[PDB]
């Protein structure tokens, strides 16, 4: 009703879904974090790497909402799906689930930049690049590096490898 | 399987529900915060009072989970219901919805302390008192005080009252 | 004649017009500022909010010219139209005239980014995004917020509302 | 004979036994500490983690006695049973014996809070909660976490695992 200019309804709706994907990502990381803090799991380095993660993904969603408000859009919130798992297995399984997760957020950012361009919205561009696409590429680089390291501490000594990985790379 | 001692399954389950109630409260406050930041609402003092709120309720849920982990319990997460409203009306409506909200969290804390006592769990007691019941009583006091003030800037000059309330009590 | 590379004549000309639109905006804000400093208007908070404004819009035009020089373009200056009004009415009227003004600058920035893309000029992109489109979106957000507040101090007590708005939001 | 008020003889006696259980725990940890300092055992990280332990359990017993004096009770001391073992085996065996030990102290604290409530002694409550039950829950969490880690450095490489555990988690 007042400051909205060159901010289409389809972008608005896609921004709304992206906030939902970020908060769900936040929620996943929170679950991942408390899982590795369990007394029969107990890997503190892995718990805080995920905490953290949950914060980043939560700041992602906040940065989006505020942007949405800046353009005269309207935040609409939906239910947050619970994380896809209750137990997360080993640091390896967990780090796979995170990369799957960040890859899908990256894809959603790309699907939305492709919408920005097709909607003559050069400023969204721009906001997504300067603020999201970059972090996302670095992060996925960092997780891939971790995965490569866990995978090399592979076999036949799974317990020792996780212990050392968590002691020597994750802690903190 | 290891450190769990005098931590019943019913307490575990009730702790799980309480984390869910706290995160839903967090989510509500996030919605409330971005609502008052809209360009056709624009009350910054009210937006940050809610931000804040969302943090506190999120720290509440974290303090519970960590406790749950300390006792050898197991965090179980469920879907988070979206906030009960998409638009929150005036500062008055919003501050009513918050008190309704904090009252129901307080009741859930009480229902759980009544379970702690009936489950011979003197330590939960204790954790809930030293950490939750108190904040909750102060907070509800602070909101009631606000409500009494908004209600006195009542009629016939609604716009002026909200402006002054937000300038003189809420900002910041 | 020397460093110019991938800088079309149509972009040059549009950059020239945009500098003119920015300086005219500067001039408008200068008039707005001295108006509210008149002894029969006398609202100091509103005078310096506009001063300020005039500076920003003047830095906008300078940033454009220097860019134009960097690309080997040639600054061409035209007459500056006097502001559209000699008296600016109330803070409300004035804040409407400013938003109309900043909206039209934003549109001109967009018309020029659409030209940058259609002229295979990825660097202008880029310069406009990193430096102009963003400030413009924040600013229009800030003015819209003001307008919403003035409009809520609406009726029947116009004098009191402006006084309080200027005391409690604009000052300084 | 003077300040004693609402402090039953059965509580007095149970407090006396609890001091004895704490000092015996202190004594156990002292033995555990000097065992791992033996030249054919030689694990310094494990020796100081137990020293420490012995101090905490000794401060536990002191905090109880002083409380007992505050209420007008009378400290009665009994013989201290020697620790249940002369050699403590591996860090794993030792960390099992400690958890068994702290669990039984926790149970005794609970048996005594159940006595406090059944003796209309709201202040003991209270003293046990604010000062003992909590430390005990954290500590058992910390030991369980250790055990889970030792158990994962399990097989077939017992020597390496203890060395690394002691180097990377216990030291110091
Ligand atoms: Pd609007
Ligand atoms: Pd943790
Ligand atoms: Pd950490
Ligand atoms: Pd952690
Ligand atoms: Pd941490
Ligand atoms: Pd933006
Ligand atoms: Pd882009
Ligand atoms: Pd671009
Ligand atoms: Pd860290
Ligand atoms: Pd367990
Ligand atoms: Pd805000
Ligand atoms: Pd604030
Ligand atoms: Pd705010
Ligand atoms: Pd704020
Ligand atoms: Pd606890
Ligand atoms: Pd209690
Ligand atoms: Pd109590
Ligand atoms: Pd604040
Ligand atoms: Pd040249
Ligand atoms: Pd002035
Ligand atoms: Pd000023
Ligand atoms: Pd001024
Ligand atoms: Pd000034
Ligand atoms: Pd440039
Ligand atoms: Pd661009
Ligand atoms: Pd200023
Ligand atoms: Pd006495
Ligand atoms: Pd030693
Ligand atoms: Pd040590
Ligand atoms: Pd030592
Ligand atoms: Pd030492
Ligand atoms: Pd006492
Ligand atoms: Pd108690
Ligand atoms: Pd130490």
């Amino acid at each position: 009703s007042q400051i909205r200019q060159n901010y289409s309804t389809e972008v608005e709706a896609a921004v709304n879904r992206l906030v939902n994907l970020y908060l769900r990502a936040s929620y996943t990381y929170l679950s991942l974090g408390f899982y590795f803090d369990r007394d029969d799991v107990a890997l503190e380095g892995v718990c805080h790497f995920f905490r953290e993660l949950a914060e980043e993904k939560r700041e992602g969603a906040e940065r989006l909402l505020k942007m949405q408000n800046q353009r005269g859009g309207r935040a609409l919130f939906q239910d947050l799906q619970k994380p896809s798992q209750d137990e997360w297995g080993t640091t390896l399984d967990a780090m796979k689930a995170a990369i799957v997760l960040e890859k899908s957020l990256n894809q959603a950012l790309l699907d939305l930049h492709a919408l920005g361009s097709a909607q003559a919205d050069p400023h969204l561009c721009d906001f997504l690049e300067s603020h999201f696409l970059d972090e996302e590429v670095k992060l996925i680089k960092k997780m891939g590096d971790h995965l490569t390291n866990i995978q090399r501490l592979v076999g036949s000594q799974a317990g020792l490898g996780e212990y050392l990985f968590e002691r020597l790379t994750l802690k903190h």
Side-chain angles (χ1 to χ4, degrees), chain A residues 1-47 49-50 52-54 56-124 127-128 131-141 143-170:
Chain A
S1 64
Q2 205 183 46
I3 59 143
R4 197 172 173 146
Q5 175 178 32
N6 195 57
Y7 197 68
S8 66
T9 312
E10 293 77 320
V11 161
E12 187 171 33
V15 169
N16 291 325
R17 293 197 201 89
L18 195 73
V19 159
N20 184 270
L21 277 191
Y22 269 79
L23 293 175
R24 195 212 173 156
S26 211
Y27 204 15
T28 293
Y29 286 132
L30 169 80
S31 178
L32 251 355
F34 284 100
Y35 170 78
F36 278 104
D37 180 40
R38 280 179 34 180
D39 72 292
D40 55 354
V41 185
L43 281 168
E44 200 270 309
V46 179
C47 166
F49 160 79
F50 295 122
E52 198 312 300
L53 318 172
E56 233 96 80
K57 265 46 221 165
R58 190 210 330 124
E59 301 151 356
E62 291 172 11
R63 269 132 96 205
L64 299 161
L65 286 156
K66 171 178 159 125
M67 182 259 289
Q68 171 91 105
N69 272 352
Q70 288 173 337
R71 291 306 296 269
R74 134 81 158 304
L76 216 73
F77 290 100
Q78 296 314 141
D79 295 334
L80 282 192
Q81 292 180 70
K82 75 183 185 169
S84 68
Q85 247 127 240
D86 299 328
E87 345 247 71
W88 298 95
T90 61
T91 302
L92 215 217
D93 293 312
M95 196 86 47
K96 304 204 181 201
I99 275 165
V100 170
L101 179 70
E102 292 305 321
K103 283 173 167 154
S104 84
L105 245 26
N106 192 42
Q107 189 57 66
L109 285 165
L110 272 21
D111 298 351
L112 171 65
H113 179 295
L115 207 45
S117 274
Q119 304 266 324
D121 205 322
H123 164 70
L124 211 247
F127 179 69
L128 310 183
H131 279 309
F132 286 95
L133 270 327
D134 254 303
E135 277 187 357
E136 218 35 70
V137 153
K138 301 160 196 325
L139 184 61
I140 293 156
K141 182 58 159 64
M143 291 168 156
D145 293 349
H146 295 337
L147 206 40
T148 293
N149 290 271
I150 300 159
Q151 282 164 353
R152 127 179 91 224
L153 302 178
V154 80
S156 84
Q157 258 164 336
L160 187 55
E162 267 202 286
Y163 175 72
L164 292 158
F165 189 66
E166 177 278 337
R167 298 282 84 187
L168 265 10
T169 297
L170 301 180

